[PDB]
Each structure stands twice: as structure tokens, then as C-alpha cells.
């Protein structure tokens, strides 16, 4: 055939891939974390948006830290050979490097490590997208008028 | 408007 370029990810596998949405709205009272009013609007918008991009969307609601880790582990052990990519959306409280389960924190590195090139071989070489709606600390941006 |  003619000249070939390899500058873009192959996105014409039989499936676009999974889109896992973790929607944490209500937190255990003992944590003191506030309920995240509006997050259901986000979760519905994401489900529809990624549906129209032909992702297999799985919505999860109000997961403990243990459930988040087990979910990510199990998903990373699926056979993604026929999938072009992987998407995970995290909607929760957070601080720098951390997202909250309903009962306590999860290191973001623990979640993403399951999908490392050596640990999820059926996603090696494929784009792994993590979309994170969560705080990263407590600083406020005062802005500047233009 | 709320913070996360």
C-alpha cells in the first residue's frame, strides 16, 4: 500500500471501550463530608455524551473506598483486546492526589496503577483517560479582570 | 455554587 503514518491512536477496534462513571453524592455521616448536590446532573450528562461517542457506559453510585478499589481492579482484569480505549470518570470530593469514597479516601495512583502498561496488557498502547471532578486542595483563584 |  501507500505511505503510512502512525501519529494517531487506532480508534477503529470493534468497541470504543468502557466508560466507568463513579458518582459519589452522599457520604457516610462519620466522615463529615457534604452531599454533592448537582452531581447527578453531571453523571447523566456524561452517560449521554459518552453513549453518543459509542462507549459502553457503566454508572456506579455512592461507592466506598473498598468498592472503588475492587471495581477498578476487576475492570482492569477484563479482556479489553477488542476495545480502542478506556475512560474512567470520578465525581467526588478530593484533595491533591486523592478522591473520596463514601467512607474515606483513595489515592488516585492506586486507581490508575491497575491500568499501567505492564498490569493491563489488553490496554497496553491504548489511551487510558481519567476525568476527575474533585477538589485538589483548598486554594481559591481570585481571578483578574481583563 | 459549592465547592468539592
Amino acid at each position: 500500500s501507500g505511505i503510512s503514518l502512525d501519529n494517531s491512536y487506532k480508534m477503529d477496534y470493534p468497541e470504543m471501550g468502557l466508560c466507568i462513571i463513579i458518582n459519589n453524592k452522599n457520604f457516610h455521616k462519620s466522615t463529615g463530608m457534604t452531599s454533592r448536590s448537582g452531581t447527578d446532573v453531571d453523571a447523566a450528562n456524561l452517560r449521554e455524551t459518552f453513549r453518543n461517542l459509542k462507549y459502553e457506559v457503566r454508572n456506579k453510585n455512592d461507592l466506598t473506598r473498598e468498592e472503588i478499589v475492587e471495581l477498578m481492579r476487576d475492570v482492569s482484569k477484563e479482556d479489553h483486546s477488542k476495545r480502542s480505549s478506556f475512560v474512567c470518570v470520578l465525581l467526588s470530593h478530593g484533595e491533591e492526589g486523592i478522591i473520596f469514597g463514601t467512607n474515606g479516601p483513595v489515592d488516585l495512583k492506586k486507581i490508575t496503577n491497575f491500568f499501567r502498561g505492564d498490569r493491563c496488557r489488553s490496554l497496553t498502547g491504548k489511551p487510558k483517560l481519567f476525568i476527575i471532578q474533585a477538589c485538589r486542595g483548598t486554594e481559591l483563584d481570585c481571578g483578574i479582570e481583563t | 455554587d459549592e465547592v468539592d
Binding site: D6, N7, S8, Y9, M11, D12, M16, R36, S37, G38, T39, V41, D42, N45, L46, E48, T49, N52, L53, S85, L91, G94, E96, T112, F115, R116, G117, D118, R119, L123, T124, G125, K126, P127, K128, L129, F130, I131, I132, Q133, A134, C135, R136, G137, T138, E139, L140, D141, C142, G143 | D1, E2, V3, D4
Partner: protein, 95 residues
């Protein structure tokens, strides 16, 4: 004939800059997710993903500013934070 880094081919689309709060509207959803979904709907058949996310950065930065009765929290702004370890361009369409 070679290895790739185990950290290659990840993209982290953070709603806010390191160290910062992220803003969520109780009626409309979060500023970032509102904007991300709007830009994907408009541009996923047209633009490479980093350029989509740059439009999201612009929309969040330009179009949102919070209102609060609390002077500490009033009139603040947000910039999302695109963290790319990707090694290729990403288009959601093909062929």
C-alpha cells in the same frame, strides 16, 4: 523490538489546577463537567482531544464565576488542568 513506559498513554483531565478547590453548581452540575460534555458534543467529530480539552479550559475560565454570600468564597474562578502522557493524537472518530 523495544519497551514503552508503563506510565505512557494516560491522560488525566482534571477539573481544576493543583492545590485548588473545584466548583460545582447544585442545579447545573459542575463547571468542568458541564463544559466538557458541551465541547465533546460540539467537537468530537471535528477536533483532536487535546484541542477539545483546550476549548473546555477556555469555557470554564471565561464563562464561570461563583456567587457567594461569603466574602472568602465570592467571585472566584477556575482553570482546569490537562495532564497528558499520551504518545499519539486522539480522535474519537475514525475512517
Amino acid at each position: 523490538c523495544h519497551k514503552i513506559p508503563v506510565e505512557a498513554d494516560f491522560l488525566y483531565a482534571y477539573s481544576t489546577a493543583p492545590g485548588y478547590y473545584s466548583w460545582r453548581n447544585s442545579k447545573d452540575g459542575s463547571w468542568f463537567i458541564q463544559s466538557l460534555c458541551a465541547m465533546l458534543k460540539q467537537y468530537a467529530d471535528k477536533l483532536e482531544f487535546m484541542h477539545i480539552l483546550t476549548r473546555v479550559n477556555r469555557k470554564v475560565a471565561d464563562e464561570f464565576e461563583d456567587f457567594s454570600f461569603d466574602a472568602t468564597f465570592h467571585a472566584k474562578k477556575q482553570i482546569p488542568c490537562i495532564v497528558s502522557m499520551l504518545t499519539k493524537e486522539l480522535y474519537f472518530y475514525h475512517h
